[PDB]
Swiss-Prot record, chain B:
Transcription activator involved in oxidative stress response and redox homeostasis. Regulates the transcription of genes encoding antioxidant enzymes and components of the cellular thiol-reducing pathways, including the thioredoxin system (TRX2, TRR1), the glutaredoxin system (GSH1, GLR1), superoxide dismutase (SOD1, SOD2), glutathione peroxidase (GPX2), and thiol-specific peroxidases (TSA1, AHP1). The induction of some of these genes requires the cooperative action of both, YAP1 and SKN7. Preferentially binds to promoters with the core binding site 5'-TTA[CG]TAA-3'. The gene is YAP1. It is found in: Nucleus; Cytoplasm. Interacts independent of oxidation state in the cytoplasm with the karyopherin PSE1/KAP121 (and less strongly with KAP123). The reduced form of YAP1 interacts in the nucleus with the nuclear export protein CRM1, and in the cytoplasm with YBP1 and the peroxiredoxin HYR1/GPX3/ORP1. Interacts with RBG1. Induction: YAP1 expression is at least partially regulated at the level of translation. A small upstream open reading frame (uORF) retains the 40S ribosomal subunit. By leaky scanning it then proceeds and reinitiates at the functional YAP1 ORF. This is AP-1-like transcription factor YAP1. One of 8 closely related fungi-specific YAP proteins (YAP1 to YAP8), which all seem to be transcription activators of the environmental stress response and metabolism control pathways and to have similar but not identical DNA binding specificities. Present with 1600 molecules/cell in log phase SD medium. Residues 25-35 are annotated as: n-CRD. Depending on the oxidative stress inducing agent, YAP1 can undergo two distinct conformational changes, both involving disulfide bond formation, and both masking the nuclear export signal, thus abolishing nuclear export by CRM1/exportin 1. The disulfide stress-inducing agent diamide leads to the formation of one of three possible disulfide bonds in the c-CRD.
Length: 86, 35
């Protein structure tokens, strides 16, 4: 049902080099604060060999000062908590 | 009647209260300092 050797690709070629237009995001990631993660730490009966010091210099400079206290995307604490799991 | 909100209460642990948001959180907001 095809030559199979059909060497080709999609004629899209749509590069669209748009800059980081970060505005009203909508991906998976709840809004949590400092000790707020302390709750995340508990919600996982896993635990094994994590470093609480790395989360300090990782969540402290990703912090976003707001009147709702400091707020960070669970995508930074999930990548900071999953990159230190040996 | 729950019990949240109220801070912890166990100075017998060592000396200061255990709390749950001090130098850790109190400095995570500090970043709000204008450079």
């Amino acid at each position: 049902n095809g030559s199979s050797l059909q060497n080709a690709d999609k004629i899209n070629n749509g590069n669209d080099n748009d800059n980081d237009n970060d505005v009203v995001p909508s991906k998976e990631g709840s809004l949590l604060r400092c000790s707020e993660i302390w709750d995340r730490i508990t919600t996982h009966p896993k635990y094994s060999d994590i470093d609480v010091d790395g989360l300090c210099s990782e969540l402290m400079a990703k912090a976003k000062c707001s009147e709702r206290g400091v707020v960070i995307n669970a995508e930074d604490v999930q990548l900071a908590l999953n990159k230190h799991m040996n | 009647n729950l019990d949240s909100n109220m801070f912890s209460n166990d100075f017998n642990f060592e000396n200061q209260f255990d709390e749950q948001v001090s130098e850790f959180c109190s400095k995570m907001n500090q970043v709000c300092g204008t450079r």
